[PDB]
Amino acid sequence: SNAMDISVIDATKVNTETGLHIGESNAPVKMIEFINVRCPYCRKWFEESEELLAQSVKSGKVERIIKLFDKEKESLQRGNVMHHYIDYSAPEQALSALHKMFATQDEWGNLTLEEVATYAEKNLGLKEQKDATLVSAVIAEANAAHIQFVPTIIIGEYIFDESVTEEELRGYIEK
Numbered sequence: 001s002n003a004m005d006i007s008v009i010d011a012t013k014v015n016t017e018t019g020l021h022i023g024e025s026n027a028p029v030k031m032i033e034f035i036n037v038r039c040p041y042c043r044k045w046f047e048e049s050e051e052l053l054a055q056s057v058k059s060g061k062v063e064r065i066i067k068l069f070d071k072e073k074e075s076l077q078r079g080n081v082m083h084h085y086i087d088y089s090a091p092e093q094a095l096s097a098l099h100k101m102f103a104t105q106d107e108w109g110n111l112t113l114e115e116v117a118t119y120a121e122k123n124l125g126l127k128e129q130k131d132a133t134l135v136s137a138v139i140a141e142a143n144a145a146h147i148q149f150v151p152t153i154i155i156g157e158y159i160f161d162e163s164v165t166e167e168e169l170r171g172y173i174e175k
Contacts, residue, residue, distance in 0.1 A: 033066045049164075078113065
C-alpha cells in the first residue's frame with residue numbers, strides 16, 4: 001500500500017548507530033532499513049535488493065544499518081520474537097540468519113508466539129538473546145522520525161520501500 005507519507009517522515013531523526021551493521025564503517029553511503037522479519041513487504045525488499053546490496057557492501061560503497069522494528073500488529077508480533085534471536089556480535093552471521101528467517105517466513109509466521117521461539121531454537125538453531133535497550137531504541141528512533149510502517153528504507157533525504165526498482169535503488173546509492 002501507499003502508506004508512508006514521505007513528507008511526514010523526518011529523515012534527520014534517524015541514525016547510523018543503532019542496529020545491525022553490514023559493510024565497512026567508513027562506507028560513504030549509509031542505508032538505513034527499518035524492517036520486521038515477518039513482514040512480506042520486507043521479504044520482497046530483501047529478496048529484490050539482495051544482489052545489488054551485496055555488491056555495494058563488498059565494494060565499500062554502502063554500509064547497511066538494519067533496524068529490527070518490533071511492531072504491535074498481531075501478525076508482526078511473530079517477527080518480534082525472531083528479532084530477539086539475532087546475534088548482534090556476529091553481523092555476517094546475523095545477515096545469514098535474516099535470510100533464513102525470510103526464506104522460512106510462511107513456516108513460522110503463522111505460529112503462536114511460543115512456537116515461533118521453538119522454531120527459532122529447533123528449526124533454525126538460534127539462541128534467544130533479546131537486547132531490550134536496542135529493541136526500545138529502534139522503536140524510539142522510528143517514533144522520533146515518524147516512521148510507522150515497514151519496510152522504510154532511507155538513504156540521506158531519500159525515503160522509499162519495497163516498491164523501489166533496482167534502477168531507482170542504484171540511483172539513490174549514486175546520489
